[PDB]
């Protein structure tokens, strides 16, 4: 041995038990993967970093791109889990036809916003280039991560979705070069965008109880527009918020792209989903915006559950970039109608005709919850902050109450002697009240009357005579959580007169 | 059925933790992630939770100690099982009369501790000659009377409130000492035999805390 | 489940029963409507805001 | 006749509330929005009040437990029915002698 | 123990929802009459839907209500299939779809099945807009018949007292 | 001996990559049989008290 340790007078132990890393940001991104991927479908798998995305979940798949956005959004998250899904057996891949007609007579630049700003192409067309050469150039310039395999044929670019299903039906190629003053589009060249076939049969897994059995997830991101699949995820997260079994909470993030009538019809009373209302003319691939929103919400949960993912600072999906326009997607009438019916509305950070790229930010960070079990329009779970913070409060109160586990419980008159691992309902209630008062300004607001808001009863004073069981307690806590903060109606009243 | 750890290892850890509590705090319940954590055992984490909560409730209902992972995850670490409930397999009386006297392992451990402590206290009256309950034993005489015996027993019991019992509804009517003369028929009871009845309240285990959170969002209601 | 909730020692319920909105101002406005409207005549209907009045 | 809820559900809630009182307070009358509120049952609100008040008075007169919605509205929420009167179907003696000994369900529970 | 969606199952579910944590609830299950006839209701749906919307239905109690999303162009068959798939299994009426007609057959024979009230609680709603097209109609094509008449309480409940007897 | 559970806790791991090829399978070709039934506690543990008895 080593001197001073050989005589056994000093016995030394290292104990590396403090320095174990916490999980982090438990976000489960679910989406279809292409057959190029090495991941096993229908199995929740940890995704360490952005490196293995293409290898594991397919090159250019829906899950690959949504995971890329989740990794771009949060700080340095590695606890991103994924749930790859297989394409439906009879699924049909959407096919778009970007047909180009020429020939070009003058030089110029041909810029195209396909999908997101990460996939935009910017080619240089010279004079006399036929439509075939321009289509070949655009195909060669299409990013491989674009979830659409591009093939050129005599000037028609066929973009076939990498994933079968309706998820391919939301491609918006914008020829963001027309009328530009700086980048002059070539004379001749005409870009036209058609969608020759539509997506079809989608996955409907409905296996969350088996795949995600008790492995809790703060945020579930669904990268499918299928309302049946969204409904299955909703039912799963609703089961996760159930008094019947031990709740290990979560919150789902789905999108609903369509006309105002269609979006509103796709909604229900789901406090478990934060439905993201997207207009029909939404340029960005919807699951990318949904993934950014869910990733931002998760990356907040890890830090500040009371935060509302909302506004240009806290709800800014900076990874997403869509071209600026004067036509504002949802008109303000539609915005008010959507926010009224529990829909998360997202809008451009800046409006302009200069044709820059803008990052969408979330207008309201709400769940799709409007009304109680009596339909009794209620406000308990209107905010996504409310779900996140009710989960945080329940978990914090449970972890505090776990300190009374194992302690033997005396009557509320007994003065437990020192050295005895014990407590009585009076000491329990005192410690609970001190805990709650310790979380004022962190997890609750103040307390109207902390004595009458927190009550602890034994099972003997709740159940009938000789029916209550010993060691069972009933704790009622009427707390006031922070509210989201929806609108500030400012009424400016200029005063110009001095003698009135 | 799908329990990964060799079962006798978890059983031995549980029994060793219970013993290692007995030596210190008999009133302790080997239960929860702090006091009933079998830290020596380590099983791989899984999302499939062994017993489903329906089976957990059915087992805890029928006097079974249920044990569960300390943490649930899909990251595939190792987790130490902790004991959900520290109960014995006792549900019902000799009349089958579903009863709660020995439901907790704490109850058996603590009834043993209480019996032994009361016996070791009562051993101090062994050898003492017993006078009638009116005699005022002179000093230097190794003696006692049922009145002094009952007074010392009541003082002992009141000394163990908060250590071995809870408080006493009525310590005068909970602890009674009778001679064998006022229990047996006339001229049938034997001298020097006593009957002590003690109706105490032991600490209970503490099984569940039904917390009912009620968020209040309105200011004018 | 979730740690501290898996052992069933703490059973938790949320109870969103306090935070239900009151009706408000119960005023019934009765009057003739034109045939352009989509409302069913002779039926008391809630009017949420000024937006759907014309419709 | 126009009762929306399956009737045996409301009957079971009423009987369960009465039992769950017996265990505690036999003198309690399962009646009103606090003590006779069948909170498990939820029926849609309507302006047509099931029994009209004439029928309500006629039923309560002839020893019938009448139950009504906790709230009336046209907003179409769900409301929990509560018991108007907690009475037995007892009106008259063995001489038919209209009597009041066992008119209340509280009276039967409390005589027991 | 008492069947999935039976009358006794649902009444017991309400008894357990009502009282605090009662376990001394006793039950007295009864068999359907030999010649008992199950009530049959026909919720007939006509379309197709032309606009999207929500179709909400209060069948039985609020525990059994359905709330489906109908999209534009959904035929009556798809809407009936959706409503059937959304009908809770505890609902005491087995639901089968057939070309847009939902046949709800009582799980228990007897007159006890004759008290189903399906309310299309979505018509005229300002918040949940019912789809254009879709028409819900509720008919009861057959009535319940012969009921149990046990008359065996003296033997079944001989001296085992019961504070409350609930008859479903 | 009938309660052995070998888990190939390496499948699908992101950090420790299991080799391609290798397949681990676990079968239990025979079952345990006749057990000890001592029933001699009165003689072996006559009055030597024991706070905890652990049965393996």
Numbering used by the authors:
A (entry chain D): 2 to 501
B (entry chain D): 281 to 501
C (entry chain D): 2 to 56
D (entry chain D): 281 to 392
E (entry chain D): 57 to 224
F (entry chain D): 169 to 224
What's the paper's own text on this?
The structures of the sheath subunit in the contracted and extended states are similar and can be superimposed with an RMSD of 0.7 Å between 347 pruned Cα atoms out of a total of 491 Cα atoms with an RMSD of 3.9 Å. Upon full contraction, the Milano sheath subunit rotates by ~12° and moves by ~13 Å radially. This suggests that the disulfide bond Cys47SBD–Cys182SED needs to be released to allow for the rotation and radial movement of sheath subunits during contraction. In the contracted (post-attachment) state, the tails were straight.
Milano is a contractile tail bacteriophage that infects the pathogenic plant bacterium Agrobacterium tumefaciens, an important tool that is widely used in genetic manipulations of plants. The contractile tail of Agrobacterium tumefaciens bacteriophage Milano is flexible and bent to varying degrees, which sets it apart from other contractile tail-like systems. In this mechanism, contraction of an external sheath powers the motion of an inner tube through the membrane.
